[PDB]
Design an enzyme around this catalytic site. Structure first.
Site, PDB file in Angstrom:
ATOM      1  N   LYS A   1     -18.644  23.642  -4.747  1.00 39.85           N
ATOM      2  CA  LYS A   1     -18.838  23.358  -3.338  1.00 39.85           C
ATOM      3  C   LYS A   1     -20.289  23.539  -2.877  1.00 39.85           C
ATOM      4  O   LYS A   1     -20.717  22.810  -1.980  1.00 39.85           O
ATOM      5  CB  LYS A   1     -17.904  24.249  -2.508  1.00 39.85           C
TER       6      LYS A   1
ATOM      7  N   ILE B   1     -19.918  26.272  10.957  1.00 39.75           N
ATOM      8  CA  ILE B   1     -20.263  25.195  11.877  1.00 39.75           C
ATOM      9  C   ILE B   1     -19.653  23.886  11.392  1.00 39.75           C
ATOM     10  O   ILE B   1     -19.824  23.518  10.241  1.00 39.75           O
ATOM     11  CB  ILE B   1     -21.776  25.020  12.019  1.00 39.75           C
ATOM     12  N   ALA B   2     -18.953  23.197  12.278  1.00 42.11           N
ATOM     13  CA  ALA B   2     -18.503  21.801  12.082  1.00 42.11           C
ATOM     14  C   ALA B   2     -18.516  21.158  13.435  1.00 42.11           C
ATOM     15  O   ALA B   2     -18.151  21.811  14.435  1.00 42.11           O
ATOM     16  CB  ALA B   2     -17.119  21.715  11.446  1.00 42.11           C
ATOM     17  N   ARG B   3     -18.929  19.894  13.548  1.00 44.37           N
ATOM     18  CA  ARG B   3     -19.084  19.246  14.829  1.00 44.37           C
ATOM     19  C   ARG B   3     -17.719  19.066  15.524  1.00 44.37           C
ATOM     20  O   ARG B   3     -16.693  18.855  14.880  1.00 44.37           O
ATOM     21  CB  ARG B   3     -19.790  17.914  14.671  1.00 44.37           C
TER      22      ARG B   3
ATOM     23  N   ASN C   1     -12.754  32.888   8.149  1.00 41.91           N
ATOM     24  CA  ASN C   1     -13.938  32.086   7.916  1.00 41.91           C
ATOM     25  C   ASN C   1     -14.636  31.761   9.225  1.00 41.91           C
ATOM     26  O   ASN C   1     -13.997  31.468  10.250  1.00 41.91           O
ATOM     27  CB  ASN C   1     -13.528  30.789   7.211  1.00 41.91           C
ATOM     28  N   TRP C   2     -15.990  31.826   9.161  1.00 47.02           N
ATOM     29  CA  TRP C   2     -16.874  31.394  10.239  1.00 47.02           C
ATOM     30  C   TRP C   2     -17.735  30.242   9.711  1.00 47.02           C
ATOM     31  O   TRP C   2     -18.401  30.372   8.665  1.00 47.02           O
ATOM     32  CB  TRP C   2     -17.808  32.527  10.671  1.00 47.02           C
TER      33      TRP C   2
ATOM     34  N   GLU D   1     -26.186  11.643  12.929  1.00 47.12           N
ATOM     35  CA  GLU D   1     -25.995  12.667  11.867  1.00 47.12           C
ATOM     36  C   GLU D   1     -27.324  13.039  11.176  1.00 47.12           C
ATOM     37  O   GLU D   1     -28.374  12.373  11.322  1.00 47.12           O
ATOM     38  CB  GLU D   1     -24.962  12.217  10.797  1.00 47.12           C
TER      39      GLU D   1
HETATM   40  C1  LIG Z   1     -26.249  23.843  10.858  1.00 43.71           C
HETATM   41  C2  LIG Z   1     -25.180  22.775  10.973  1.00 43.71           C
HETATM   42  C3  LIG Z   1     -24.216  22.724   9.979  1.00 43.71           C
HETATM   43  C4  LIG Z   1     -23.247  21.717   9.953  1.00 43.71           C
HETATM   44  C5  LIG Z   1     -23.239  20.781  10.990  1.00 43.71           C
HETATM   45  C6  LIG Z   1     -24.189  20.834  12.051  1.00 43.71           C
HETATM   46  C7  LIG Z   1     -25.162  21.866  12.039  1.00 43.71           C
HETATM   47  C8  LIG Z   1     -26.172  22.040  13.131  1.00 43.71           C
HETATM   48  C9  LIG Z   1     -24.034  19.746  13.097  1.00 43.71           C
HETATM   49  C10 LIG Z   1     -25.198  19.463  14.055  1.00 43.71           C
HETATM   50  C11 LIG Z   1     -22.837  20.041  13.977  1.00 43.71           C
HETATM   51  C12 LIG Z   1     -23.852  18.436  12.297  1.00 43.71           C
HETATM   52  C13 LIG Z   1     -22.591  18.431  11.477  1.00 43.71           C
HETATM   53  C14 LIG Z   1     -22.695  17.643  10.094  1.00 43.71           C
HETATM   54  C15 LIG Z   1     -21.983  18.412   9.160  1.00 43.71           C
HETATM   55  C16 LIG Z   1     -21.872  18.219   7.692  1.00 43.71           C
HETATM   56  C17 LIG Z   1     -20.659  17.855   7.068  1.00 43.71           C
HETATM   57  C18 LIG Z   1     -20.443  18.173   5.755  1.00 43.71           C
HETATM   58  C19 LIG Z   1     -21.403  18.819   5.001  1.00 43.71           C
HETATM   59  C20 LIG Z   1     -22.587  19.198   5.575  1.00 43.71           C
HETATM   60  C21 LIG Z   1     -22.806  18.861   6.906  1.00 43.71           C
HETATM   61  C22 LIG Z   1     -21.279  19.722   9.989  1.00 43.71           C
HETATM   62  C23 LIG Z   1     -19.969  19.201  10.326  1.00 43.71           C
HETATM   63  O1  LIG Z   1     -19.704  18.524  11.322  1.00 43.71           O
HETATM   64  N1  LIG Z   1     -18.962  19.435   9.388  1.00 43.71           N
HETATM   65  C24 LIG Z   1     -19.106  20.264   8.319  1.00 43.71           C
HETATM   66  O2  LIG Z   1     -18.122  20.402   7.585  1.00 43.71           O
HETATM   67  N2  LIG Z   1     -20.241  20.964   8.143  1.00 43.71           N
HETATM   68  C25 LIG Z   1     -21.233  20.824   9.020  1.00 43.71           C
HETATM   69  N3  LIG Z   1     -22.322  21.633   8.890  1.00 43.71           N
HETATM   70  C26 LIG Z   1     -22.510  22.331   7.614  1.00 43.71           C
HETATM   71  C27 LIG Z   1     -21.655  23.565   7.402  1.00 43.71           C
HETATM   72  O3  LIG Z   1     -21.848  24.512   8.440  1.00 43.71           O
HETATM   73  C28 LIG Z   1     -21.939  24.230   6.069  1.00 43.71           C
HETATM   74  O4  LIG Z   1     -21.590  23.261   5.049  1.00 43.71           O
HETATM   75  C29 LIG Z   1     -21.209  25.550   5.833  1.00 43.71           C
HETATM   76  O5  LIG Z   1     -21.403  25.934   4.475  1.00 43.71           O
HETATM   77  C30 LIG Z   1     -19.742  25.464   6.186  1.00 43.71           C
HETATM   78  O6  LIG Z   1     -19.166  26.793   6.096  1.00 43.71           O
HETATM   79  P1  LIG Z   1     -18.080  27.148   4.951  1.00 43.71           P
HETATM   80  O7  LIG Z   1     -17.082  26.041   4.888  1.00 43.71           O
HETATM   81  O8  LIG Z   1     -18.873  27.300   3.673  1.00 43.71           O
HETATM   82  O9  LIG Z   1     -17.540  28.495   5.437  1.00 43.71           O
HETATM   83  N4  LIG Z   1     -22.239  19.773  10.996  1.00 43.71           N
HETATM   84  K   LIG Z   2     -20.039  29.661   6.168  1.00 46.88           K
HETATM   85 MN   LIG Z   3     -16.910  30.261   4.331  1.00 44.10          MN
END
Ligand SMILES: Cc1cc2c3c(c1C)C(C)(C)C[C@H]1C=C(c4ccccc4)[C@]4(C(=O)NC(=O)N=C4N2C[C@H](O)[C@H](O)[C@H](O)COP(=O)(O)O)N31
Ligand SMILES: [K+]
Ligand SMILES: [Mn+2]
Ligand SMILES: Cc1cc2c3c(c1C)C(C)(C)C[C@H]1C=C(c4ccccc4)[C@]4(C(=O)NC(=O)N=C4N2C[C@H](O)[C@H](O)[C@H](O)COP(=O)(O)O)N31
Ligand SMILES: [K+]
Ligand SMILES: [K+]
Ligand SMILES: [K+]
Ligand SMILES: [Mn+2]
EC number: 4.1.1.102
Lengths: 500, 500
Positions: free
Chosen positions: A388, A168-170, A165-166, A279
């Site tokens: 999800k 984004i999570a902070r 898996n790839w 956030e």
């Molecule tokens: C574009 C982007 C996406 C995210 C975030 C950010 C940016 C710029 C930052 C700026 C870092 C802010 C935080 C705030 C976030 C946040 C936390 C929960 C839900 C949404 C956002 C979070 C984060 O910390 N934790 C998280 O679990 N998902 C994040 N996502 C969403 C996430 O990339 C998607 O949901 C994606 O689908 C994951 O992949 P997968 O699990 O499906 O393979 N993150």
């Molecule tokens: K993803």
């Molecule tokens: Mn995924």
């Protein structure tokens, strides 16, 4: 290398587009870089490239802010996103989301392993780096740490090797060789972590790659299905196999042109303080620190003159709106169609702080279903809010075919005039809630459950015999020949360009 | 005469402001005038003055469209409204609404009777006019009649003589000497009509004055209290007694400078077909004709070169938004304060199609009340939704002191992020509903009852100890000296006027 396949090439593309400002004088990573970026995002200005970051040493690092934010003009509003995907800069939102969905009914194209790439130009072992000595930004004045990770891609693999898996999570710096970050259900990083915790034998092999291929960072931000390896999805989307190099200290594979790579482990046992962070919904709650996941960094590799992308997230408009909201909406559109629901389009209005998704209904198909608002609302909400892809979304707005869901003014119009509060809504209290929304995690009810609603902005005859109104607007309340006459004589009379 | 006291002077003011386009070539009242006006309203252009209306005869009539609509610039956005009230053209919404409320704790200044005025320059008796022969506009292509009355003031008096009401209500031509129009509860024209019907002896003496003093048409559009004569309220607001002349055929009094006056009766027994009409919420339902009130016209008097004002109402933005919504919000603000509720400001967001009002709360005062969301929501909704000033409003949004309710983006932000659907809301089903909203009169429930909600966008600590967040925005998440540095270096770096 093409812009969508190489972050360095993407930065050149933004220059070439007159969509970059290079800042070559010293800029402080303590707040100043992020403040400039914040201002950019609030005004839809050019992306800032900070080439002279106070504290950059040995090549680590420059910063690119606002990589996925909006342009000022209407004609190329989404051009930065288009440049992630090889699309023309004038691409519509519909075209961007269709590109992101296109790999969903294609065979994956697995990645290609190559022996080396630019990400191996420089390295620092575990005796040579200190994460507290790098120019990691303080993004918001009350943040609980310096958030190194706002636009990189975490790489983790299931224990059995079948899913990489790839996403984004902070994450923020904890100490010289550790990060803390968010790892929460139902996210795939969390799902995979749980697999390793249940096996109980080792910490999770991990890498975090910054400045990855733009097409990869878009998929990293999209909720593609459980078990689907993003690299093969991106390969299919782009029509090319992505080139990956092995990590030095583990057997994960990172994009060959990654700007900066951290290699290490995600603990199955340890935690540390994480947050608060300003956030996506526009808030920070100063002092709200909680325990987060803990990552150990064993090695750094990086390109010569490495560039770290950064999201200065918060109030409108940044990557957390353009990418999180839009990409979730895309997946929800597909999910609905695969459940036999007559949805043609979906978008998360920016005005809703991407907490709503508007679903455009093919009302001809709806009429054939011979159903009612109550029944249809329940069906839609059950599908979306139990998946999800619906996690981040608390309100679904159903609209008929006359509404362009990509236009927030029209969604707002339809919601406000076609959905009777209470009667035309169904509340969902026994679904997963998104705790990051203030009214959830800092609100009056359970942080993790409920607070969701389907709001039906379909009018009654849309279920039966067809639309029974005309809009009281220039378009609909005047015949064609009169409209054209008015337009043709507009400047002549005395009243007041597309690109702008 | 001053612009706020004389419609002819107001038209000159708009010219002088470069806020008028005079159209001196022939324009068709069948759709063309209204289509131009519609376009103006959708683009915030200059008001159109149609000096050469096809079918104008013997001085009846020119048309001014968009008299209370918006200007393009932010700095003088509300300047047309300011010109109704003697306020500078840069006046804020707060200043306009405060001016409209100012007479609420002043003694009335009763009107002054004068022997004649411009409205007596020309007359037509009951053998000389035919309303079907005048250039009355067809405003929207599916309208059920030619709506002569969209921006005039109806004048009716209680049987006992103690209350003379001035208000706007639509009316269309029925035949050579009758109109039909809306006369619905709880409006004052309806309340007074009911008094005459209960007495049962005669039809209601009536006049309809078009092109009245601008300050008068604003009060005509405001829900000032039951029993309060608008002329004395306007007198107090403006600091001057309004000059009125007696009708020729009845003992009502009309503004001396009225452009056009119809004199006659409002029947206590007869009705006729009325509507449909392209209405304030943006819709027309073709064919939805219903019986309306019936007016008999006995005499017309008018100024030389008379000008009829016209609202081409519908989708954003026109007089039905700028005046109906804003003026109701003003009255609701006062009503709340007089019920000891800690409300500082109120506005009906245009994005809500003026179906919402956002109420800004003085949260210091709220904290002292030692109350809860449920209790406070119920209190507010009981006060507002059981009063005539709340008639048109279906959703109240409570927000704290950080939100500017006059800024729809900020209301939308707060609503979307601070109010948990369901839990943070109270529905009101046993209140009067506004049937003109499509989800009411053309919806799934009773047209005249319910469908209202109070949505609490106050966060929990706003009731207890105080706000516990900072916004993740440029303003709040960076110190002052850094913000100023960024601003001062903005153009120098390479990034991008108030009047514009
Ligand atoms: C574009 C982007 C996406 C995210 C975030 C950010 C940016 C710029 C930052 C700026 C870092 C802010 C935080 C705030 C976030 C946040 C936390 C929960 C839900 C949404 C956002 C979070 C984060 O910390 N934790 C998280 O679990 N998902 C994040 N996502 C969403 C996430 O990339 C998607 O949901 C994606 O689908 C994951 O992949 P997968 O699990 O499906 O393979 N993150
Ligand atoms: K993803
Ligand atoms: Mn995924
Ligand atoms: C500014 C304006 C006001 C109104 C209208 C219009 C304009 C331009 C048009 C374009 C003609 C559209 C229709 C659509 C209308 C509509 C119908 C019901 C409620 C609101 C609007 C209506 C109408 O037909 N009937 C009505 O009962 N009230 C109207 N008002 C509101 C009304 O002037 C205020 O409510 C005011 O407070 C009355 O005075 P009072 O009774 O308190 O003394 N009307
Ligand atoms: K509905
Ligand atoms: K009135
Ligand atoms: K709340
Ligand atoms: Mn009144």
């Amino acid at each position: 290398q093409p812009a969508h396949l190489c972050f360095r090439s993407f930065v050149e593309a933004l220059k070439v587009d007159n969509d970059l400002v290079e800042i070559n004088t010293p800029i402080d990573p303590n707040l100043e870089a992020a403040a400039i970026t914040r201002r950019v995002c609030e005004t839809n200005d050019k992306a800032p490239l900070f080439n002279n970051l106070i504290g950059m040493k040995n090549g680590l690092f420059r910063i690119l802010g606002a990589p996925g934010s909006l342009r000022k003009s209407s004609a190329d509003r989404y051009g930065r996103l288009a440049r992630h995907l090889a699309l023309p800069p004038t691409a519509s939102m519909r075209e961007i989301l269709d590109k992101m969905l296109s790999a969903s009914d294609m065979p994956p194209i697995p990645p290609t392993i190559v022996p080396t790439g630019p990400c191996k130009e420089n390295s620092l072992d575990d005796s040579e780096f200190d994460l507290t000595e790098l120019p990691v930004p303080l993004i918001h004045k009350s943040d609980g740490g310096k958030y190194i990770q706002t636009y990189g891609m975490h790489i983790v693999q299931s224990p059995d090797g079948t899913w990489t898996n790839w996403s984004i999570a902070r994450a923020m710096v904890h100490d010289k060789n550790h990060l803390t970050g968010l790892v929460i259900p139902p996210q795939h990083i969390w799902q995979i972590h749980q697999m390793w915790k249940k096996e109980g034998r080792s910490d999770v092999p991990w890498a975090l790659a910054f400045g990855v291929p733009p097409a990869a960072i878009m998929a990293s931000s999209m909720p593609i299905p459980d078990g689907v390896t993003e690299a093969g999805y991106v390969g299919a989307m782009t029509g090319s196999s992505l080139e990956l190099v092995k990590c030095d200290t583990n057997d994960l594979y990172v994009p060959a042109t990654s700007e900066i790579v951290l290699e290490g482990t995600l603990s199955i046992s340890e935690t540390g303080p994480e947050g608060p962070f300003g956030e996506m919904h526009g808030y920070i709650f100063p002092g709200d620190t909680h325990l987060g996941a803990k990552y150990k960094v064993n090695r750094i590799t990086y390109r010569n003159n490495a560039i770290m992308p950064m999201s200065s997230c918060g109030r409108l408009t940044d990557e957390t709106h353009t990418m999180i909201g839009s990409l979730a909406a895309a997946e929800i559109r597909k999910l609905c169609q695969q459940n036999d629901l007559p949805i043609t389009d979906a978008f998360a209005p920016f005005e809703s702080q991407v907490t709503w998704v508007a679903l455009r209904v093919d009302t001809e198909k709806l009429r054939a279903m011979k159903t009612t608002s109550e029944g249809f609302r329940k069906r839609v909400g059950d599908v979306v809010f139990n998946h999800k892809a619906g996690y981040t979304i608390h309100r679904l707005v159903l609209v008929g075919d006359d509404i362009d869901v990509y236009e927030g003014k029209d969604v707002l119009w339809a919601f406000s005039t076609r959905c009777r509060p209470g009667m035309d809504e169904t509340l969902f209290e026994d679904v997963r809630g998104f705790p990051l929304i203030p009214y959830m995690g800092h609100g009056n009810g359970p942080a993790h459950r409920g607070g969701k609603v389907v709001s039906d902005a379909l009018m009654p005859t849309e279920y039966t015999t067809g639309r029974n109104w005309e809009a009281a607007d220039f378009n609909q309340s005047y015949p064609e020949d009169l409209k054209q006459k008015v337009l043709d004589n507009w400047t002549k009379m005395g009243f007041s360009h597309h690109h702008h």
